[PDB]
Design brief:
Distance between the termini: 27 Å
Structural class: alpha+beta
Strand order of the largest sheet: 2-1-4-3
Radius of gyration: 10 Å
Order of helices and strands: EEHEE
CATH architecture: Roll
CATH topology: Ubiquitin-like (UB roll)
Shape: globular
Function: Binds to the constant Fc region of IgG with high affinity.
Strand content: 35-45%
Subcellular location: Secreted, Cell wall
Organism: Streptococcus sp. group G
Protein name: Immunoglobulin G-binding protein G
Number of helices: 1
C-alpha cells in the first residue's frame, strides 16, 4: 500500500510517499530517510490516512 510522510523539520519540510507491504515497513523506510537527512524529531502515525509525521 501507499504510505505518506509529512516532514516538518527545522530545515526540511514537505511530503513523500513510499509503497510498502505494511506500516512497520514504511516506518523503517521513512525513519531511515529522516535520519539520513538530518531530521531529529517526534513522530506520529495515523493508520486511517496511512500517514507518518516527523516534527522538529
Amino acid at each position: 500500500g501507499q504510505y505518506k510522510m509529512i516532514l516538518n523539520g527545522k530545515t526540511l519540510k514537505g511530503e513523500t510517499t513510499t509503497e510498502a507491504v505494511d506500516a512497520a515497513t514504511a516506518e523503517k523506510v521513512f525513519k531511515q530517510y529522516a535520519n539520513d537527512n538530518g531530521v531529529d524529531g517526534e513522530w506520529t502515525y495515523d493508520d486511517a490516512t496511512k500517514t507518518f509525521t516527523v516534527t522538529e
